[PDB]
Design a protein around this ligand. Structure first.
Ligand code: COH
Ligand code: COH
Ligand SMILES: *[C@@H]1O[C@H](CO)[C@@H](O[C@@H]2O[C@H](CO)[C@@H](O[C@H]3O[C@H](CO)[C@@H](O)[C@H](O)[C@@H]3O)[C@H](O)[C@H]2NC(C)=O)[C@H](O)[C@H]1NC(C)=O
Ligand SMILES: *[C@@H]1O[C@@H](CO)[C@@H](O[C@@H]2O[C@H](CO)[C@@H](O)[C@H](O)[C@H]2NC(C)=O)[C@H](O)[C@H]1NC(C)=O
Ligand SMILES: *[C@@H]1O[C@H](CO)[C@@H](O[C@@H]2O[C@H](CO)[C@@H](O)[C@H](O)[C@H]2NC(C)=O)[C@H](O)[C@H]1NC(C)=O
Ligand SMILES: *[C@@H]1O[C@H](CO)[C@@H](O[C@@H]2O[C@H](CO)[C@@H](O)[C@H](O)[C@H]2NC(C)=O)[C@H](O)[C@H]1NC(C)=O
Ligand SMILES: CC/C=C\C/C=C\C/C=C\C/C=C\C/C=C\C/C=C\CCC(=O)O
Ligand SMILES: CC/C=C\C/C=C\C/C=C\C/C=C\C/C=C\C/C=C\CCC(=O)O
Ligand SMILES: CCCCCCCCO[C@@H]1O[C@H](CO)[C@@H](O)[C@H](O)[C@H]1O
Ligand SMILES: CCCCCCCCO[C@@H]1O[C@H](CO)[C@@H](O)[C@H](O)[C@H]1O
Ligand SMILES: CC(=O)N[C@@H]1[C@@H](O)[C@H](O)[C@@H](CO)O[C@H]1O
Ligand SMILES: *[C@@H]1O[C@H](CO)[C@@H](O)[C@H](O)[C@H]1NC(C)=O
Lengths: 551, 552
């Protein structure tokens, strides 16, 4: 079998077979040397002794509120800290990207083919004696067993951080512009060739689709007016393909950028909001530039919305997730004097860690009504009957579920959660502990250590036998959360690097893009730099309801 | 008309309409301010006082031969200078890329659609009163007139730098992996979506084409053996689509990565050499890695040949062009402590400046035979009759034409030279002086300053009327050359930044790729770092003939 099956190389060293039973580790720029890159250099040894553990940095950022109030209000100091935050996490991502599901060694195919999700860790070789390499049993525990014993929801566990359904549907809507798995090809493949925040979920992946969604007057997107209220146009009027079951009336078959957004009224809510926002921006730009044509009005509005998205995602969305007292800042200028690659490639593992199905509640509470999953799916008449205003008011009030801590995946989505385990195995994912080492974390030495608890640990112990063969995905959902937090260590220390690369690696953040002329002047630039989840709703939802990402 | 037609914004500021009749310059990070980004900042005043002219910099590098011989033999000094060569030049390129033929403003279409060549300078707006903006006549001079008067060759003008046919065909072969204009779509469109040195001209642009060219054993490419010599496989054997006229029979229809390389035997020579090289690397890798399968063998060989190409382009090809006494170095480690984007987008203007048709000779001299263009075109029989050994020997010793200096485009390719002018015009290119400013160069104040000569300068003024409406492409071919040099100032100062960016911006130069493991260990890595035009020939051509890019 492959000599690298045991993953002998440490500290981001690279394994290469040198014969049927021999390997060699490449320790170049790891800061380590020796057969397995285990011996540290003098500079590295001191650097290791001083580096605070992720849980210590988390403590500081979620305590000393009085000091953070001061830091947050000194621009020079706030910028300095945000600069470290960005740079320290960006470094953990390979850019230009390296491996994918088919290539556990660097290759031009892996680099050039945008149809693949990239991979933070190479896949386990096909001929390895064990699913994870050398350790554990010949088969991983049955995925259904794992799901039922440690993942499925017994009782609904609310998020201690206060996350609401406004946040939950935002996460789903937003992340679904770059998580577009090509099922015709396989789970290691994507339909989102932009590999980041291009807003294809509003505008369409292809030009052909974009043009069916456009009005071609004043730069705007097509729309319909039902009961005085602006909604996306129909499948019939646009000839835009959407996923809908055949029983749904032509009227409620809304056509938007992303084919799957008719699945959930919550997604259609943000689809309508962003559609309204783009047309609102077109009106603003048409007044600033009465001399501009439709094409520039559209293009310029798109870039502004990309700006709004990255701004809202950092300063509202990530801010809320973080639980920090420190105010995260969206400012491209922070990287202008730093070494940073303005490019991104969506990692398969980023996709997997983002399967936050526990967020989903048992019922969807709108006004006085409580809708079940069956009632809620594909039902756009709920959005029409209640209206966006009510939808915002209700989902701001309804708490979402805790992601970590175990046993909170709703039964309605059991098949999806099982799929997340199966496809991980199909894609030959390395173990949780390997992913932890890859992201500078000390590997878990027991199931009790991972879970911070006793019952789920015991079950997992009987299923996997060895902590070093625990899988990434189920571990993220069973992990001990941070104090009163939605996630545990692994979720954050993997998610944040992937997250920040995709946000800052956007072209609009590059020095040659980050200037007022890119966005139609100061007026367009102003829209970005003052954008918030509150302003987004206020500008586009009748009666400007209050909103946030917490209850 | 559009308020930015006059190109009012200077020093890299960006123009934006602010009404039907008014504009605004965005002077962000230009180092200048004011209405037209003309008022320099204090730090910028100091920088413009200390920075030497490109002509001064060229002089130092092409003189003091003894000093550079010391510099080239102290590794630290050589590394320090090469570092500046790369950095001082790379800020001149927008990366991520900005404009294209359809977008004079930054947009997502422009950034995300890889089918476009990018643009170093936005196109002149459609509604502008004159083709160049506001200056000049309603129409530009007839392209035929510009071609006939100052471009077409009379007496053959050899390149004083001594560039040979080995250089000419290498240039043609190497650049045609990234200059692949999509003529069904338009001149502003490319079919090379890799936008750089991916060797698609050897391996194919698509996966289906690659798979028809591969042997699927030992990581090799398909081939045939004619008279003991390894040559590309046929169209009949591979089912790989190639551009061949009807009269060309099945046997002489070689299938290679790039569909037009059958056009010229000179290109097929390099296609055959590189095909042999790939398969030679596979053998080396097989010996190092008996456990490796076909796919990895092929993949890592590709990565090695990409490395070899970049090595040869910098240390032989560009080295020769530059005419420097200073030895250029391919070393990615030099950029690891620098701000640099490992990405590239081929610029339309880079394509245009690379139409070096004056390089082409009147006839192609091989052994005792002098072949005319008609005799040479689409004729791989010539290749088989003489063999690659005689091709290298003959082409190594035949001199190329001088590109700059005017009146040196062969008549045989006159329709091509005309097309470059016509296509620049439909692509709405800005004037020469606008591109010169774009690249930190002083605009020419007269046609005599452009040529350094009286006769052509007179012909040009009678056609263009104003120096500020002179087109970029014809200007490059008529430009006053540097002393005893193949090119003039504009060619180099535009070409060099596009080039280095294309080469160093390759992902194999990034810290995570620039490791022995990427190339199958230290032996694979050594093949990249010791590559040269001579070794390429020596390793793959019977008898190991001597070669270089100059005579002889
Ligand atoms: C952000 C949190 C979140 C939420 C709230 C959510 C809520 C819901 C929901 C109820 C409203 C339904 C019916 C679905 C249904 C699906 N989910 Co999500 N999902 C979420 C995170 C994800 C992500 C991320 C993916 C991967 C997308 C992909 O691969 O296409 C996913 C996968 C899926 C898929 C693709 C199948 C696959 O194999 O990946 C479907 C269908 N699920 N989801
Ligand atoms: C680098 C120097 C060089 C040389 C030596 C050279 C030698 C020759 C040559 C004799 C060997 C002939 C018959 C031609 C003829 C042509 N040249 Co070149 N060309 C050169 C530089 C270029 C470049 C660069 C392009 C742009 C390629 C493209 O696809 O637009 C080009 C374009 C062309 C085209 C149109 C592109 C197409 O797809 O057909 C033709 C025809 N020509 N050239
Ligand atoms: C990116 O990677 C994809 C996966 O390798 C690749 O899709 C694959 O394309 C090949 C060739 O186009 C298909 O293989 C087919 O080749 C023979 C040719 O004779 C056909 O008769 C068969 O249909 C055979 O399947 C693969 O089917 C296909 N793999 C899939 C669907 O997963 C993409 O082409 C690559 N992307 C680019 C732009 O190159
Ligand atoms: C910024 O723009 C330039 C033109 O690009 C210049 O405007 C022109 O000034 C000329 C005299 O110097 C006039 O002949 C001409 O009327 C005018 N062109 C216009 C406005 O259409 C401005 O002077 C210059 N501004 C500054 C501050 O120097
Ligand atoms: C590098 O790693 C290899 C394989 O992980 C080490 O070989 C192992 O050594 C340990 C302790 O002596 C044994 O438990 C294993 O039996 C050995 N190999 C295997 C496959 O089990 C090797 O010692 C390491 N190199 C150094 C010097 O640290
Ligand atoms: C990149 O741009 C080109 C040109 O706009 C796009 O090609 C056009 O596609 C539309 C709709 O599919 C066709 O109707 C036209 O015939 C095409 N125009 C041409 C050939 O000039 C191309 O689709 C774009 N690429 C991507 C990835 O969207
Ligand atoms: C293409 C990718 C672009 C954007 C990424 C999208 C969303 C990112 C949001 C969350 C990422 C996943 C898990 C949590 C990780 C980080 C956010 C929370 C806390 C960490 C704060 C920090 O240090 O950045
Ligand atoms: C993707 C593109 C990558 C590489 C292009 C390869 C070769 C380009 C060669 C010539 C272009 C034309 C003119 C200048 C070219 C090279 C520089 C020559 C002299 C100046 C030396 C220097 O300052 O680097
Ligand atoms: C509501 C859906 C849950 C069905 C669980 C079926 C698998 C049984 O799982 C068991 O669940 C018990 C109750 O939490 C735990 O005490 C046990 O540790 C666990 O093994
Ligand atoms: C030996 C030719 C060098 C001088 C030519 C410059 C004048 C251009 O003359 C042109 O030459 C073309 C090529 O035959 C012809 O097609 C044109 O009809 C002719 O006018
Ligand atoms: C059709 C054509 O161009 N004929 C040529 C011929 O002149 C030449 O003698 C031969 C060399 O091999 O190649 C063929
Ligand atoms: C859709 O929503 C309506 C209320 O708007 C609800 O009464 C109905 O039952 C739902 N449809 C389905 C099929 O559940």
């Amino acid at each position: 079998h492959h000599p690298c099956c045991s993953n002998p190389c440490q500290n981001r060293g690279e394994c290469m077979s040198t014969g049927f039973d021999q390997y060699k580790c490449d320790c170049t720029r790891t800061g380590f040397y020796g057969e397995n890159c285990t011996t540290p250099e003098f500079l590295t040894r001191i650097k290791l002794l001083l580096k605070p553990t992720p849980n210590t940095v988390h403590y500081i950022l979620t305590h000393f509120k009085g000091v953070w109030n001061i830091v947050n209000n000194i621009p020079f100091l706030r910028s300095l800290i945000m600069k470290y935050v960005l740079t320290s996490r960006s470094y953990l991502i390979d850019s230009p990207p390296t491996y994918n599901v088919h290539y556990g060694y660097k290759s031009w195919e892996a680099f050039s083919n945008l149809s693949y999700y990239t991979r933070a860790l190479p896949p386990v070789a096909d001929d390895c004696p064990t699913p994870m390499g050398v350790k554990g049993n010949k088969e991983l525990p049955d995925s259904k067993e794992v799901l039922e014993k440690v993942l499925l929801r017994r009782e609904f566990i609310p998020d201690p951080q206060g996350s609401n359904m406004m946040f939950a549907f935002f996460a789903q809507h937003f992340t679904h512009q770059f998580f577009k798995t090509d099922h015709k090809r396989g789970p290691g493949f994507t339909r989102g060739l932009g590999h980041g925040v291009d807003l294809n979920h509003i505008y369409g992946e292809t030009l052909d689709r974009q043009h069916k969604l456009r009005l071609f007057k004043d730069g705007k997107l097509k729309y319909q007016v039902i009961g005085g209220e602006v909604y996306p146009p129909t499948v019939k009027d646009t000839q835009v393909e959407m996923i809908y079951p055949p029983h749904i009336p032509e009227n409620l078959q809304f056509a938007v950028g992303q084919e799957v957004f008719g699945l959930v009224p919550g997604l259609m809510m943000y689809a309508t909001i962003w559609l309204r926002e783009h047309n609102r921006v077109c009106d603003i730009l048409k007044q600033e530039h009465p001399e501009w044509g439709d094409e520039q009005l559209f293009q310029t509005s798109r870039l502004i919305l990309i700006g709004e998205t990255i701004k809202i995602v950092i300063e509202d969305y990530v801010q809320h997730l973080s639980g920090y007292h420190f105010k995260l800042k969206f400012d491209p200028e922070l990287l202008f004097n730093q070494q940073f690659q303005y490019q991104n490639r969506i990692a398969s593992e980023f996709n997997t860690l983002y399967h936050w199905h526990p967020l989903l509640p048992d019922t969807f509470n709108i006004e006085d009504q409580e809708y079940s999953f069956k009632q809620f799916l594909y039902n756009n008449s709920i959005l029409l009957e209640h209206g966006l205003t009510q939808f915002v008011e209700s989902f701001t009030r309804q708490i979402a579920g805790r992601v970590a801590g175990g046993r909170n995946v709703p039964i309605a989505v059991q098949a999806v959660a099982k799929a997340s385990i199966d496809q991980s195995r199909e894609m030959k994912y390395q173990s949780l502990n390997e992913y932890r080492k890859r992201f500078s974390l000390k590997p878990y030495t027991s199931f009790e250590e991972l879970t911070g608890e006793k019952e789920m640990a015991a079950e997992l112990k009987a299923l996997y036998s060895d902590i070093d063969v625990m899988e990434l995905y189920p571990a993220l959902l069973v992990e001990k959360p941070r104090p009163d937090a939605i996630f545990g260590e692994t979720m954050v220390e993997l998610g944040a690097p992937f997250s920040l690369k995709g946000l800052m690696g956007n072209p609009i953040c590059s020095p040659q893009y980050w200037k007022p002329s890119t966005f139609g002047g100061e007026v367009g630039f102003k829209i970005i730099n003052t954008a918030s989840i509150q302003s987004l709703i206020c500008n586009n939802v009748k009666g400007c309801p209050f909103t946030s990402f917490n209850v």
